[PDB]
Amino acid sequence: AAPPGEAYLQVAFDIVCDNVGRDWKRLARELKVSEAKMDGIEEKYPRSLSERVRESLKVWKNAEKKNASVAGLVKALRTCRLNLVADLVEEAQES
């Protein structure tokens, strides 16, 4: 059901998570992720970058479908302000 190509996206979600990890919560609110999920992850995890972003990133990744590829998130994150993760996925792809 979710993006079957989660393997490639998961690699990008890994370098970017440990880099701008807190900015996914910022993007999660923009993506209108389940408010209930944020309530549990935020309250349960007061300082875990991995714990808060993973749940919020999981729901966003499922709704992305074709946008589950980096071209989707890298285009959006860098155009707005997340140049940090853009540089990460960028050098990873070499191009």
Q: Are 77 and 86 in contact (CB under 8 A)?
A: yes
Residue 82, helix vs strand vs coil: coil
Calculate the CA 45 to chain-centre distance.
17
CA 68 to CA 61: how far, in whole Å? 5
CA 66 to CA 71: how far, in whole Å? 10
- DSSP secondary structure string, 14-55? HHHHHHHHHHHHHHHHHTT--HHHHHHHHHH-SS-HHHHHHH
**Which domains, and CATH codes, for the chain?**
1-95 (1.10.533.10)
The helix, strand and coil proportions of the chain, stated in percent and rounded to the nearest 5, come to: 80, 0, 20
70 to each of 6, 31, 39, 45, 76, how far by Cα in Å? 10, 16, 27, 26, 10
